[PDB]
Design a binder for this molecule. Structure first.
Ligand SMILES: O=c1[nH]c2cc(Cl)ccc2o1
Ligand SMILES: [Cl-]
Ligand SMILES: [Cl-]
Ligand SMILES: [Mg+2]
Lengths: 142, 128
């Protein structure tokens, strides 16, 4: 998937498509909008192809990663979603939404201790008060 | 992954990992890089294998390539902030002090590793 592609690219350390600016920013913006057009109409498979395409070109992009993680979470591919949410957080650092969603994924992965750590981080560090309420409601049930 | 099909026994992979670190510790960087690349081909999902290759890239002053692997390495452990610490170092070398500051601050705010936080704080203290 997207992560193995990123790791292969780093191993081989050859020229990538982004390194040569093979797709301009404006076209990447268009494709991202098309990806969500598919997603918003429930065409999840096509959206996934488009977000995979975006993540091959520019993996280290919080917006592309978050789109793909959402798809995996909807498809109940919870480990793949949590892995991408963690990448997104490492790049973004200031938005705790991926940490919240990782907590949800860990709950489904039968890892309540990992989920608890996620929700507690949201509570202690997020300034999104509504997200904190949601995290607390998961914490109350664990 | 080749790991998924158990193409090489577990103990032999342990041996290869320890040999890679031997090369690294002896300054045999080119050989260590071959061995860590070998490991990461065998199992891209092994955080310690990725961290080894990232360290090689950082030593070779390929700071963006190192930072890219550190971001993957962080996701593959979720709770270990050491790759975030090293990313902060790489960002300083890339002349991105605000990005570096964010990394070291994240270590201090989330990590339970007290020795690592001590190191991150010493970087934060130095950043203008
Ligand atoms: O300690 C941590 N930080 C984390 C960040 C994400 Cl995205 C998930 C789990 C975590 O555990
Ligand atoms: Cl993958
Ligand atoms: Cl900066
Ligand atoms: Mg607060």
């Amino acid at each position: 998937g997207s992560i193995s592609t990123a790791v292969i690219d780093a191993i081989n350390s050859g020229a990538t498509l982004k390194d040569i600016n093979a797709i301009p920013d404006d076209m990447m913006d268009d494709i991202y909008s098309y990806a969500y057009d598919f997603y918003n109409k429930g065409r999840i498979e096509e959206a996934e192809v488009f977000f995979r395409f975006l993540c091959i070109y520019d993996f280290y992009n919080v917006d592309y990663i978050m789109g793909l993680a959402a798809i995996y979470q909807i498809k109940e591919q919870f480990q793949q979603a949590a892995d991408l949410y963690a990448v997104a957080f490492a790049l973004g650092k200031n938005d705790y939404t991926p940490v919240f969603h990782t907590g949800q994924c860990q709950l489904r992965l039968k890892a309540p201790l990992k989920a608890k750590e996620c929700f507690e981080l949201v509570i202690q560090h997020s300034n999104d008060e509504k997200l904190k309420i949601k995290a607390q409601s998961y914490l109350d049930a664990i």
